[PDB]
Amino acid sequence: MKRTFQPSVLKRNRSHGFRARMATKNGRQVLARRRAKGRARLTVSK
Amino acid sequence: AVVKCKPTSPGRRHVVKVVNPELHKGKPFAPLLEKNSKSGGRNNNGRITTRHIGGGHKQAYRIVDFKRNKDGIPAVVERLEYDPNRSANIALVLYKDGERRYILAPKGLKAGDQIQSGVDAAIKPGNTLPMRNIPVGSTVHNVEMKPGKGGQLARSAGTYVQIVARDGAYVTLRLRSGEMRKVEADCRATLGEVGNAEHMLRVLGKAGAARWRGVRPTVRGTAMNPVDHPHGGGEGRNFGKHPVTPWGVQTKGKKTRSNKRTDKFIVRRRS
RNA sequence: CGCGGGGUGGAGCAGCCUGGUAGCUCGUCGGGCUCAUAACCCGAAGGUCGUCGGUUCAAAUCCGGCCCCCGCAACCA
RNA sequence: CUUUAAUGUUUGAUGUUCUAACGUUGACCCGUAAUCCGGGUUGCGGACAGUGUCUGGUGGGUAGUUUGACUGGGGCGGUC
RNA sequence: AAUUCCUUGUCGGGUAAGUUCCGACCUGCACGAAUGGCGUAAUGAUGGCCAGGCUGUCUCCACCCGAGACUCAGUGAAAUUGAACUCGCUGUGAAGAUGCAGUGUACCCGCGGCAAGACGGAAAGACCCCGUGAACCUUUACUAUAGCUUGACACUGAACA
RNA sequence: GCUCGCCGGAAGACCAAGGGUUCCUGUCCAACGUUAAUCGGGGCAGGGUGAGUCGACCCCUAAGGCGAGGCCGAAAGGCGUAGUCGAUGGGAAACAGGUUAAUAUUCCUGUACUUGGUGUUACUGCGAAGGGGGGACGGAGAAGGCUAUGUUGGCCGGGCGACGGUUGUCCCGGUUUAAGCGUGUAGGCUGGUUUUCCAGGCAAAUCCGGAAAAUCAAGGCUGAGGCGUGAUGACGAGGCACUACGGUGCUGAAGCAACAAAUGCCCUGCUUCCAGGAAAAGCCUCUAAGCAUCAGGUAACAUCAAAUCGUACCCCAAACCGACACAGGUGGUCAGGUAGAGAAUACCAAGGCGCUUGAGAGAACUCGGGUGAAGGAACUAGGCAAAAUGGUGCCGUAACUUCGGGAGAAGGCACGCUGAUAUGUAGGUGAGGUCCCUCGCGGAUGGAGCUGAAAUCAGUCGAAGAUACCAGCUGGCUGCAACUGUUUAUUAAAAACACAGCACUGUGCAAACACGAAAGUGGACGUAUACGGUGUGACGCCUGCCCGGUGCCGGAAGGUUAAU
RNA sequence: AGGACCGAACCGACUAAUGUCGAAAAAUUAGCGGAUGACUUGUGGCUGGGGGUGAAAGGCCAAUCAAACCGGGAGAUAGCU
């Protein structure tokens, strides 16, 4: 069937990426929380 | 002309093309063009402002000069040009100076006739001049409200304004709707009824005839659910509610006129 | 199984509601106008107010039995 | 006291005119190559319109709830 | 009649047999002229009926060729499950008994099969009812409110009829 | 390794995407593989990705995003100008051959091309965020000429063959060559050139546009492919030579003609129709503020530079997505032979595989199917399932109708092969020879060769000739919907929804309406033959009576009536 | 010319069997319907929780929709089991 996840990096990084997050007020709220739990993969990258 | 197409298939059974055998079948004059990426009927924040929009063929917005800001300069009509962005068809007219412009081709104006803009423009359809210079009882179009915008009233095909009177600084114009509004006498208007007045005779037949226009399918209210529409709902297929809009407005009878800063200008109400 | 209203000259309605006096159009009988009828004009009669009991200075009126009519009801898996 | 009459004086409701308030998604110019905008001229309206406060009406477009019980199952019916 | 309760209405046709169907009679419980009425060529993976054709759908199935089932070697789950030495019948009993009483019967243990029961297994019944539960939706249920609209005041001034 | 069998418009060969060493090599077997496993996409270790011409980064834009001031909003923040980003877009330039255990349009040999910097010589005026041209474009249809490619033949090389014929009209294999350059055809487009003048292109202008004159009839632009060159080069079958027995080294004949022919190219064409068919930069060119012993530009030449990143492998699947080595989903290019209209399909080529459990048994029963006496829907909710009809040309073809259809209606005749008309016809293409010439890729003419339907007649084979794969059941009545289409993805695909048409009604533009506390936008850069709301739903005949109630609209004299 | 006729790649999903702890958290097999159009589709954007979108089913918004998911109100309340 047509499964709901056909990956495409370009779409992904521009909708979940670092700059795609830092560009908003609520964005730094996320970077705050990801470091709050000390996680490593805060945003998708290489 | 109003071509009654021969019934070949149920679809070509009810289609009538408005084909004028004088149209330039070749590609038009480039320098007066401009693209126009359709909006899909959305506001700056993205939500749909009105339905039945979005789609159709790509259209090129040709920069038509309605303004007619040239004075005392003769011209020659080279060819009747077709434009998708209008019910009527514009005309590529060339002046003596070397400027080619697009206008609203009037009724009796073929490719080869002469026009002129200015206050000295004698009587002949297509000429732009002040209304106090224009003899009362005639027919005009492309009229403004204030000198300097271009022309709003009587713009689409087959539309005409009949100048009733010229009471002082205000002129009396009997519009197409029967609604009369006074306009400053310094206003400029172009003479003659707009040509290509056969568009109301156009019958489509094809459902796609509106689809390649850009118009989306128009649904009815007696089908939906109450959560998305004031109408809708029913097991025995009820209607039962007073005819309203998707926003509770008492339609099919309710004049929504409310501006007041311009209510000093409606002479006679639209009969 | 239930509920609401009604039952008034030959036909159909008033009066009841807030208790004495019973009205109207047509119709029945008759006279008259026309040669005849109809139509029209005029007068009188015609009502145990479905029925009995109770109670009240009056029973058509207030109330309780019996009979008749209209609408909905014969339901949910 | 009633009916009336000229005036001084104190306010209100209409008509018309006007321009400074204001509006201007009119022309034009400059900032500036720039359809935003601001300002400057001029034209067109005009103490309107518009916004704020308070207020009457409308108002399921929007929102928060109600929508009884006994019942030889419930409902109808009936009753408290 | 996608509408007619009664009803398989009545009549005629189609079959030897027609609660369906086709054409009509009007007694329309309760069609109706834009929540359009009556027809309508063409179109239709549409609903219903009939005929021809063609066939195992059927009278009644028969044989054969492959893939599993059966066997061997290897690998090796699953729902479920209080405890079990776990028979039928009659009756009684939280009201249909494998287990209680009476009684008949039955060597112990597997395989291949078929499915009546163990009110078998899966889903804390989606049905009826209840909770002074919830959820949206409706409106001439109550009260508010967006928005629209009216007026007073403010921004708002100058003069005369 | 020899056979068998499978797909072969794919289960093949290559790319984008997305993964991330799964590629290749050696070694190893507990764990992964639904089995065994010295095998592998498993563990350990080593190697491998070589670019001025490929893609991207880069230049410049679309939808749209963000966005100095600005406008606005409790704050957050929203919108948006100038700008700045963003391809699936446009914009410069390379192919063949050989080689590796694994990578090569990148490496090596050979043959070419592109944009810039400095310098040299000879000339000449150059110069913008400004202007013009170009870039630059739609669907469908048909035609002409070729190419990729295939077939036959000729020639060369080998064989003449384990059971009958086989030196002959026999058999098999090969017969391959690009980029660029020169020429610049078939074809298409368009009248060039010279002079003057001008409220035009926010200014200027020799560039463009316009109006009158002038001379002559072509010039110019563009353009697949062929032909030469590229190339006395490479490659190339088969021999010749050593085996770690996997392969390497050496050498090298023929290398063309004809026909058929694409969905490839000319074509970013032409005719025509309508729904009317991006933008900027690169590039060519004109000049402003200006600068002229200059700076720069044009042309020829020498030389230097062309960075960075990706580059392995998989890429219609055991490596992507589906928890799995999953009968599923996944864009684009190339795509041979015979029959066949065809990319259907059947059998084969190139190439890759037999699907990672099998050996016996042949019971019931289940599933996928074949066939079946006589009857032929008696089955059943119902002709559901199976069966049957199924191809080409011609003949013939009703009711009804909006005169298009209905209709491929129904129902029928002939279909193989061989010979003959004719040592394979009509037709197609077409060398040589000949003539002419404003000499080239020429025009007429001429006919060898090659290729190749169909119709008729005669004869013959079988029960059957569309003999297989492939491939319509038909007629009639009638309800509804007009029709194609759309929808409950994952139980309802229709009578529901839409539909064009019609009717009513709102809107005179800072339009209503709609999102948004506002600004700002869509509506529309449209303005009444228009736009939004609602109702019904092609076409034909028509669409009655009721203004009580509700709602709406118009008029407000009067009653009542909030704040002030 | 055709929302024209037959029928492949492509797209969809009417009928029936197989399957239902399956090959698979809606598929295969054999017939089907459209297939130059209201067409299909790759890539890259815009519109969002009382809102989006809708050829209008109360379908869809990551296998989850008469109001998605995550965390915080909140150890909500529970005359109930």
Curated annotation (Swiss-Prot), chain A:
One of its GO terms (biological process) is cytoplasmic translation. PANTHER family: LARGE RIBOSOMAL SUBUNIT PROTEIN BL34M, MITOCHONDRIAL RIBOSOMAL PROTEIN 34 FAMILY MEMBER. Part of the 50S ribosomal subunit. Pfam families: Ribosomal_L34. GO terms for molecular function: structural constituent of ribosome. The keyword Ribonucleoprotein applies. The lineage of its organism: Bacteria, Pseudomonadati, Pseudomonadota, Gammaproteobacteria, Enterobacterales. It comes from the Bacteria. It comes from Escherichia coli (strain K12). GO terms for cellular component: cytoplasm; cytosolic large ribosomal subunit. Belongs to the bacterial ribosomal protein bL34 family. InterPro entries: Ribosomal_bL34 (IPR000271), Ribosomal_bL34_CS (IPR020939). The keyword Oxidoreductase does not apply. Keywords: Ribonucleoprotein, Ribosomal protein. This is Large ribosomal subunit protein bL34. Gene3D superfamilies: 1.10.287.3980.
UniProtKB/Swiss-Prot annotation, chain B:
GO terms for biological process: cytoplasmic translation; negative regulation of DNA-templated DNA replication initiation; ribosomal large subunit assembly. GO terms for cellular component: cytoplasm; cytosol; cytosolic large ribosomal subunit; DnaA-L2 complex. The keyword RNA-binding applies. SMART domains: Ribosomal_L2, Ribosomal_L2_C. The modification N6-acetyllysine is found at K241. Residues 27-52, 220-271 are annotated as: Disordered. Keywords: Acetylation, Ribonucleoprotein, Ribosomal protein, RNA-binding, rRNA-binding. SUPFAM superfamilies: Nucleic acid-binding proteins, Translation proteins SH3-like domain. Pfam families: Ribosomal_L2, Ribosomal_L2_C. Part of the 50S ribosomal subunit. Forms a bridge to the 30S subunit in the 70S ribosome, contacting the 16S rRNA. Interacts weakly with S6 in one of the 3.5 A resolved structures. In pull-down experiments interacts with CedA. Belongs to the universal ribosomal protein uL2 family. One of the primary rRNA binding proteins. Located near the base of the L1 stalk, it is probably also mobile. Required for association of the 30S and 50S subunits to form the 70S ribosome, for tRNA binding and peptide bond formation. It has been suggested to have peptidyltransferase activity; this is highly controversial. In the E.coli 70S ribosome in the initiation state it has been modeled to make several contacts with the 16S rRNA (forming bridge B7b, PubMed:12809609); these contacts are broken in the model with bound EF-G. This protein can be partially replaced in vivo by its H.marismortui (HmaL2) or human (L8, from the 60S cytoplasmic ribosome) homolog. This is Large ribosomal subunit protein uL2. The gene is rplB.
